[PDB]
């Protein structure tokens, strides 16, 4: 790896010498991609290969990044840096590497300049430091600790927290790149206010995470009560809260797992209750994807384990039900050219694309990985979401003009999610619909699968049909419907009333998905 | 000529976990005595004579296989070369009923005991009835393996072992100098029954000074702070030695004890790839001891100076080095005490697995010294079992599912497979399987690919297939496994073929429990991805369980297919000047060159009663004489063990001498030993010598018993180099000869009994060279036998029997249920039954009476 590092030093002096007072320019440009491609590709070189010199050579490559300090270019040289940011992830006798100590300067240089350039002046911005997103990511692959894990950089949160409020200034340059700096407390030990304020013991002894077994928790206690206290409508009162809330919530999860387990559930339910702010249809399109992608992790915050999520799902479903009347505006414009369609096209597009970006992801993240188990175990786990929430799928299944929403997926970077919206719920919404385990619904579904109107299907649903033939229903059906039915429900209208939903699903959703 | 059937009982063998064997090193005196008592009320069970035999097996018999075996049924003791037995008046080894003389010639009657003693310095087993000695022993047998005490039995028998450790009350006094499960039994485990299957260098001076001085200060400080005060009395229990004073007055051998230990330590460390030099070199001299109260400075006067490492760990890299050093120290301790010195005094056990607790105690004892030395500144750096449903239950179309549970988290594979699953191939290495191995979280089809998360303990996994859209889906505890690319079990476009079949495979020491859906309650989850997706539990609508065929390991014989890739045989017709010949060929290319492959002929050569008494091997004159001879019936198969040397090879010819019939094995390339072998030869590979044992050692009082014969000659073959002596590439014509009778001749006239008078050799289509396949298929029986103190007494009450075919040509039994997928012997047996019905024609009752011998009324009712 070191055979090609010599060429780097020869060009930095000549570049300034020729201008301020060539083949060398390309002789540095060419090795960039060549080294970066293999360095990023062979990430499995770390553990089974290069047992001791991997750290030193990666550290030498990192120390080569000091060229950015000397030669600050508005034009990016990403061809090397984009792939060289991924070499950071790639026994007490490790004194060979010396930039283990220069790590302090490497960390301090990026964040120290924000105070200098708080004025941010006509066009000048934080492009020099904006690249720290890749470097700040240290979740798992930790080779060396050297006690220089969070002692110094913890002092730089307050510079970032200074721009928490809007303060009637121009919007934050890198609110997203501010959050990456907060690791989930993976520094193997931590205690607040000892290194931040007490310098008397910092140089002497690091006694932390063991003596303060109950004093380590001092930041989350103040960071948990307040954001839950704010529940205002507009996104202004949370000016940097979307960029500042995910990391404390993530950090407390791993800490004290063997001892303190209630913190995770407390934070999860606190955020679930806070989601009532997001519950409304459209308030800030910028905040919708950021908060969803920042921390879509649920540990013990599902409907079944937490009855509070059962109530929250009721509010979510109530919000979802408005979508039918919301999309009825499309039929209003399509009703024989009642009015000009231009004024309604944009409204329909927004009301179809923006609201669905959050709610569907929320359940599919980890809620649909836990609710169907309880739903299969008993019919009463989510009977409310079983007998309801099917109307949301109908609006997207019909009105094919709404397929244009794929423009919303286009900006992410066609297997559109529209078909997959009830895919996770395809075993939960219609499981408690009709003849839970009886197989008697086959005849009704076949009869209703004629592209019939809703009213006509409802009229035909009054006939009722059953089958006790010596068919396959000997021992799967009628032998596990009964034990699974804690309270045997005998209501033809109530069962066919969910049966037409399955029939419409057959007629529209997967029938088109196969063609699509 | 035909396949005969009868009712056969299930013979079951059991064996305690007592390891006895011979090797260069640990022996445990190699001599062991054993006692067992029998209690039964079934001297003649309703089926047939009961089975009860006692003896030893060298951990390779693999006898207990419920069903047919090499003879008639899976006999457990004394019906092969790998076991020895005694049943009251008998000496069984390889289906031979060798009789013995002893007072009270009765079988193992109830309320009786038998004693078995084994000497290993001289290989010998002797048996003794309750009170009287027995006039027969086994000797001169191979020792390559661990000899295990075994007993075979049938139903209706209670049997109690005698250990002597806690409740073994030996009704017969132990013989002079045999360990009764006393010295070393289960040293690292418990006992339980288990069925089978002037100017010195400065660096050296510095290291010696450091280590020696520090440890010598250590023992003193450790004892004197533990409280080892100056006692006046001389105690041996606590072993307090008042005369034992500081290092200076240590005995004379202490100098060599100190020198040699460090010398071996440095010699071993030199081969560990260390790096000499200065790393810290600070704690030795620049050590700054923290403020310690003088309370620790007790009246000894010697200052304790331990390095403060209450929170600092040196390295896990030194863990392997310390483990190796501890292993070497354990070996030298074994040398001192038992395993290498074999001291006879009074404990311990073999050094390989003596005791985990003792090993870790020694490791802890020797680890802290190295830790302190380094902290001062010198910092330094056998197969797989396959199970499947039979071809009858092949699924052709639909959506199906079955569950599996992995008790362990080792090597397992579960999935679907084509019905013609060829054995000897790992699952997923060909088109014939679609399997999942969660040990690393991988899918297997024509190779391995990453798929899904690895297992945990139990971790019920469900497997489903949908032939309608040609898909295979794997679920884990109610959630579908996901691929790396986010696909939903990407197995698009799988050909229907000849249906599909469930398949499981377990490695060594792995336990799995799979449910095909016979009863839906046994399905662990079956509530998420199987109910409303329409998937059918595999064996759902059935009143009987599934046969569940499995993979055998015993290497039975099979003919070489004509379509073999690189093993092609030939059948040249006999010319005017030469008889018919059988040449082989091999692909002398980048193809495989496997080990010497054993080839066998189709028909056997039974011997009357003698009448030949010997066999002669020769090129053109007398070769190695005294070829092993037997002289009884002993069906014999022509054999040939050759190695692919590239090009061509043997030519199992068929010659005919002037007045004798010699079989010839022409050769041209290189050395390949070619002489016939027994019909029961089913060994492994990688071995040429020491595969014959069990010479009968019955004698008389004054050493005048003339009933010694080197029987059990399984490998009745010679070796090549005995014949020639040269360095060239000539042709060799080995012409063994065994048969010779009155000709007033060839090999062909001694095997068909229809051309015995014909002198002309013949090669009819019945003749075909065979070869032993390492693995075949077998059928798991639908039922098994039912089978805890005072020597772990065990009882078997419920009777169980079976009916099975027997092939006269190979003298081997086979469960008749196998015909269901054999599909050819089934047709032959059906036509045989039709022939019986025909020959017992209308109104012909004498033939019916005759057939009433070939078949029985109980057999027909069964």
From Swiss-Prot, chain A:
Post-translational modification summary for this protein: The N-terminus is blocked. Channel activity is modulated by phosphorylation.
Superkingdom of source: Eukaryota
Tissue: Detected in skeletal muscle (at protein level). Fast- or slow-twitch skeletal muscle.
Cellular compartments annotated: Sarcoplasmic reticulum membrane
Role this protein plays: Cytosolic calcium-activated calcium channel that mediates the release of Ca(2+) from the sarcoplasmic reticulum into the cytosol and thereby plays a key role in triggering muscle contraction following depolarization of T-tubules. Repeated very high-level exercise increases the open probability of the channel and leads to Ca(2+) leaking into the cytoplasm. Can also mediate the release of Ca(2+) from intracellular stores in neurons, and may thereby promote prolonged Ca(2+) signaling in the brain. Required for normal embryonic development of muscle fibers and skeletal muscle.
Miscellaneous remark of the record: Binding of [3H]ryanodine indicates that the heterozygous channel is activated by Ca(2+) concentrations 4-fold lower than normal. Single-cell analysis of cotransfected cells shows a significantly increased resting cytoplasmic Ca(2+) level and a significantly reduced luminal Ca(2+) level.
Domain writeup: The calcium release channel activity resides in the C-terminal region while the remaining part of the protein constitutes the 'foot' structure spanning the junctional gap between the sarcoplasmic reticulum (SR) and the T-tubule. Pore opening is mediated via the cytoplasmic calcium-binding domains that mediate a small rotation of the channel-forming transmembrane regions that then leads to channel opening.
Assembly and interaction partners: Homotetramer. Can also form heterotetramers with RYR2. Identified in a complex composed of RYR1, PDE4D, PKA, FKBP1A and protein phosphatase 1 (PP1). Repeated very high-level exercise decreases interaction with PDE4D and protein phosphatase 1 (PP1). Interacts with CALM; CALM with bound calcium inhibits the RYR1 channel activity. Interacts with S100A1. Interacts with FKBP1A; this stabilizes the closed conformation of the channel. Interacts with CACNA1S; interaction with CACNA1S is important for activation of the RYR1 channel. Interacts with CACNB1.
Similarity annotation: Belongs to the ryanodine receptor (TC 1.A.3.1) family. RYR1 subfamily.
Protein name as annotated: Ryanodine receptor 1
Originating species: Oryctolagus cuniculus (Rabbit)
Residues shown, of full length: 2956 to 3613 of 5037
UniProtKB/Swiss-Prot annotation, chain B:
Boundaries of every B30.2/SPRY domain copy: 1-168, 347-521, 610-744
Assembly and binders: Homotetramer. Can also form heterotetramers with RYR2. Identified in a complex composed of RYR1, PDE4D, PKA, FKBP1A and protein phosphatase 1 (PP1). Repeated very high-level exercise decreases interaction with PDE4D and protein phosphatase 1 (PP1). Interacts with CALM; CALM with bound calcium inhibits the RYR1 channel activity. Interacts with S100A1. Interacts with FKBP1A; this stabilizes the closed conformation of the channel. Interacts with CACNA1S; interaction with CACNA1S is important for activation of the RYR1 channel. Interacts with CACNB1.
Compartments where found: Sarcoplasmic reticulum membrane
Additional remarks: Binding of [3H]ryanodine indicates that the heterozygous channel is activated by Ca(2+) concentrations 4-fold lower than normal. Single-cell analysis of cotransfected cells shows a significantly increased resting cytoplasmic Ca(2+) level and a significantly reduced luminal Ca(2+) level.
Residue ranges, annotated region (Interaction with FKBP1A): 40-51
Function noted in UniProt: Cytosolic calcium-activated calcium channel that mediates the release of Ca(2+) from the sarcoplasmic reticulum into the cytosol and thereby plays a key role in triggering muscle contraction following depolarization of T-tubules. Repeated very high-level exercise increases the open probability of the channel and leads to Ca(2+) leaking into the cytoplasm. Can also mediate the release of Ca(2+) from intracellular stores in neurons, and may thereby promote prolonged Ca(2+) signaling in the brain. Required for normal embryonic development of muscle fibers and skeletal muscle.
Consequence of substituting residue 371 to C: Decreases protein stability
Ranges: Sequence repeats: 198-292, 293-381
Domain writeup: The calcium release channel activity resides in the C-terminal region while the remaining part of the protein constitutes the 'foot' structure spanning the junctional gap between the sarcoplasmic reticulum (SR) and the T-tubule. Pore opening is mediated via the cytoplasmic calcium-binding domains that mediate a small rotation of the channel-forming transmembrane regions that then leads to channel opening.
Domain of life according to the entry: Eukaryota
Family: Belongs to the ryanodine receptor (TC 1.A.3.1) family. RYR1 subfamily.
Protein name per UniProt: Ryanodine receptor 1
Effect ascribed to mutating residue 130 to D: Impairs interaction with FKBP1A
Phenotype for residue 377 to S: Decreases protein stability
Tissue/organ expression: Detected in skeletal muscle (at protein level). Fast- or slow-twitch skeletal muscle.
Post-translational modification comment from the UniProt entry: The N-terminus is blocked. Channel activity is modulated by phosphorylation.
Phylogenetic lineage: Eukaryota, Metazoa, Chordata, Craniata, Vertebrata
């Amino acid at each position: 790896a070191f055979g090609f590092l010599q060429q780097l030093l020869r060009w930095m002096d000549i570049s300034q010498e020729f201008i301020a007072h060539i083949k060398f320019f390309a002789k540095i440009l060419l090795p960039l991609i060549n080294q970066y491609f293999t360095n990023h590709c062979l990430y499995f070189l770390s553990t089974p290969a290069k047992v001791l010199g991997s750290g030193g050579h990666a550290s030498n490559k990192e120390k080569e990044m000091i060229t950015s300090l000397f030669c600050k270019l508005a034009a990016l040289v990403r061809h090397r840096v984009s792939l060289f940011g991924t070499d950071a992830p790639a026994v007490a006798l490790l004194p060979v590497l010396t930039t283990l100590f220069q790590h302090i300067a490497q960390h301090q240089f990026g964040d120290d300049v924000i105070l200098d350039d708080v004025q941010v002046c006509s066009i000048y911005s934080l492009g020099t430091t904006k690249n720290t997103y890749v470097e700040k990511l240290r979740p798992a692959l930790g080779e060396c600790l050297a006690r220089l894990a969070a002692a110094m950089p913890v002092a730089f949160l307050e510079p970032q927290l200074n721009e928490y409020n809007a303060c009637s200034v121009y919007t934050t340059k890198s609110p997203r790149e501010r959050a990456i700096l907060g690791l989930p407390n993976s520094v193997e030990e931590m205690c607040p206010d000892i290194p931040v304020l007490d310098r008397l013991m910092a140089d002497i002894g690091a006694r932390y995470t063991e003596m303060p077994h109950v004093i380590e928790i001092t930041l989350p206690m103040l960071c948990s009560y307040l954001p839950r206290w704010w529940e205002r409508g507009p996104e202004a009162p949370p000016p940097a809260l979307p960029a500042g809330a995910p990391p404390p919530c993530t950090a407390v999860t791993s800490d004290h797992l063997n001892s303190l387990l209630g913190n995770i559930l407390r934070i999860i339910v606190n955020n679930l209750g806070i989601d009532e702010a997001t519950w409304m249809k459209r308030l800030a399109v910028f905040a919708q994807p950021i908060v969803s992608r920042a921390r879509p992790e649920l540990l013990h915050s599902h409907f079944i384990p937490t009855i509070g999520r059962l109530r929250k799902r009721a509010g979510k479903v109530v919000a979802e039900e408005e979508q039918l009347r919301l999309e009825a505006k499309a039929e209003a414009e399509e009703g024989e050219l009642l009015v000009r369609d231009e004024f309604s096209v944009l409204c329909r597009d927004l009301y179809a694309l923006y609201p669905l970006l959050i709610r569907y992801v929320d359940n599919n993240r980890a809620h649909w990985l836990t609710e169907p188990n309880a739903n299969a175990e008993e019919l009463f786990r989510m009977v409310g979401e079983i007998f309801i929430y099917w109307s949301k799928s109908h609006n997207f299944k019909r009105e094919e003009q709404n397929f244009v929403v794929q423009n919303e997926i286009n900006n992410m970077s066609v297997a559109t999610l529209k078909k997959m919206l009830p895919i996770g719920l395809n075993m939960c919404a219609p499981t408690d619909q009709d003849l839970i385990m009886l197989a008697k619904t086959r005849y009704a579904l076949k009869d209703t699968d004629e592209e019939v109107r809703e009213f006509l299907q409802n009229n035909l649903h009054l006939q009722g049909k059953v089958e006790g033939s010596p068919s396959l229903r000997w021992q799967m059906a009628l032998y596990r419907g009964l034990p699974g039915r804690e309270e045997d429900a005998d209501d033809p209208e109530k069962i066919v009333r969910r049966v037409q939903e399955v029939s419409a699903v057959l007629y529209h959703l997967e029938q088109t998905e196969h063609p699509y | 000529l035909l396949l005969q059937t009868n009712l056969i009982n299930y013979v079951t063998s059991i064996r305690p976990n007592i390891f006895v064997g011979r090797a260069e090193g640990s022996t445990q005196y190699g001599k062991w005595y054993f006692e067992v008592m029998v209690d039964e009320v079934v001297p003649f069970l309703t089926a047939q004579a009961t089975h009860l035999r006692v003896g030893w097996a060298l951990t390779e018999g693999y006898s207990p296989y419920p069903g047919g075996g090499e003879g008639w049924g899976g006999n457990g003791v004394g019906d092969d070369l790998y076991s020895y037995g005694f049943d009251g008046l008998h000496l069984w080894t390889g289906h031979v009923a060798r009789p013995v003389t002893s007072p009270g010639q009765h079988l193992l009657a109830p309320e009786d005991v038998v004693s078995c003693c084994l000497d290993l310095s001289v290989p010998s087993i002797s048996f003794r009835i309750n009170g009287c000695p027995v006039q027969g022993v086994f000797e001169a047998f191979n020792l390559d393996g661990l000899f295990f005490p075994v007993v075979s039995f049938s139903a209706g028998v209670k049997v109690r072992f005698l250990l002597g450790g806690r409740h073994g009350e030996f009704k017969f006094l132990p013989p002079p100098g045999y360990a009764p499960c006393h010295e070393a039994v289960l040293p690292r485990e418990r006992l339980r029954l288990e069925p089978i299957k002037i100017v010195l260098p400065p660096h050296l001076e510095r290291i010696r000074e450091k280590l020696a001085e520090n440890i010598h200060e250590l023992w003193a400080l450790t004892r004197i702070e533990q409280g080892w005060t100056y006692g006046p009395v001389r105690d041996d229990n606590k072993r307090l030695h008042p005369c034992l004073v500081n290092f200076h007055s240590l005995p004379e051998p202490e100098r060599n004890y100190n020198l040699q230990m460090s010398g071996e330590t440095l010699k071993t460390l030199l081969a560990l790839g260390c790096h000499v030099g200065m790393a810290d070199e600070k704690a030795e001299d620049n050590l700054k001891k923290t403020k310690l109260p003088k309370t620790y400075m007790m009246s000894n006067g010697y200052k304790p100076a331990p390095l403060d490492l209450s929170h600092v760990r040196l390295t896990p890299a030194q863990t392997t080095l310390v483990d190796r050093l501890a292993e070497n120290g354990h070996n030298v301790w074994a040398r001192d005490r038992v395993a290498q010195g074999w001291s006879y005094s009074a404990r311990l056990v073999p050094y390989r697995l003596l005791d985990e607790a003792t090993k870790r105690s020694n490791r802890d004892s020797l680890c802290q010294a190295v830790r302190t030395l380094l902290g001062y500144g010198y910092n330094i750096e056998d197969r797989v079992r396959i199970f499947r449903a039979e071809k009858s239950y092949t699924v052709q179309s639909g959506r199906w599912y079955f569950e599996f549970e992995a008790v362990t988290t080792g090597e397992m594979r579960v999935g679907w497979a084509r019905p013609e699953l060829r054995p000897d191939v790992e699952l997923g290495a060909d088109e014939l399987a679609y399997v999942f191995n969660g040990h690393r979280g991988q899918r297997w089809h024509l190779g391995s690919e990453p798929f899904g998360r690895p297992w945990q303990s139990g971790d019920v996994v469900g497997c489903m297939i949908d032939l309608t859209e040609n898909t295979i889906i794997f679920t884990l505890n109610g959630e579908v496994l996901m691929s790396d690319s986010g696909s939903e079990t990407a197995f698009r476009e799988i050909e229907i073929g000849d249906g599909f079949l469930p398949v499981c495979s377990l490695g060594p020491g792995q336990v799995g429990h799979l449910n095909l859906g016979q009863d839906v309650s046994s399905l662990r989850f079956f509530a998420i991805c199987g109910l409303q997706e329409g998937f059918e539990p595999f064996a759902i609508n059935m009143q009987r369980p599934v046969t569940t065929w499995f993979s055998k390991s015993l290497p039975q014989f099979e003919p070489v297919p004509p379509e073999h890739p690189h093993y092609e045989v030939a059948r040249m017709d006999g010319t005017v000047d030469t008889p018919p010949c059988l040449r082989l060929a091999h692909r002398t290319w980048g193809s495989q060159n496997s080990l010497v492959e054993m080839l066998f002929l189709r028909l056997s050569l039974p011997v009357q009663f003698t009448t030949t008494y010997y066999y002669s091997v020769r090129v053109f004159a007398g070769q190695e004489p005294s070829c092993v001879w037997v002289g009884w019936v002993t069906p014999d198969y022509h054999q040939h063990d050759m190695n692919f040397d590239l090009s061509k090879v043997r030519a199992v010819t068929v010659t005919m001498g002037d007045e004798q019939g010699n079989v010839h094995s022409s050769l041209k390339c290189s050395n390949c030993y070619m002489v016939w072998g027994g019909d029961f030869v089913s060994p492994g590979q990688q071995g040429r010598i020491s595969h014959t044992d069990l010479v009968i050692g019955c004698l008389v009082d004054l050493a005048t018993g003339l009933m010694t014969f080197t029987a059990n000659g399984k490998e009745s073959n010679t070796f090549f180099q005995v014949e020639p002596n040269t360095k060239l590439f000539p042709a060799v014509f080995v012409l063994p000869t065994h048969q010779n009778v009155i000709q007033f001749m060839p090999l062909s006239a001694a095997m068909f009994l229809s051309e015995r008078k014909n002198p002309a050799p013949q090669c009819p289509p019945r003749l075909e060279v065979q070869m032993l396949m390492p693995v075949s298929w077998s059928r798991m029986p639908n039922h098994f036998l039912q089978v805890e103190r005072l020597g772990w007494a065990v009882q078997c009450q419920d009777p169980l029997t079976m009916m099975a075919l027997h092939i006269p040509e190979e003298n081997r039994c086979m469960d008749i249920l196998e015909l269901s997928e054999r599909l050819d012997l089934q047709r032959f047996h059906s036509h045989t039954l039709r022939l019986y019905r025909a020959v017992c024609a209308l109104g012909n009752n004498r033939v019916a009476h005759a057939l009433c011998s070939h078949v029985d009324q109980a057999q027909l009712l069964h």
